[PDB]
TrEMBL record:
The chain holds residues 109 to 131 of 131 of the full protein. Disulfide bonds join C7-C19. This is Paralytic peptide. Belongs to the GBP/PSP1/paralytic peptide family.
Amino acid sequence: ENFVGGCATGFKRTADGRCKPTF
């Protein structure tokens, strides 16, 4: 129960961080 959800619509995952507002 951790890979079923992540970032929001306006939130994108960073190739070096996490789920933040558009990269």
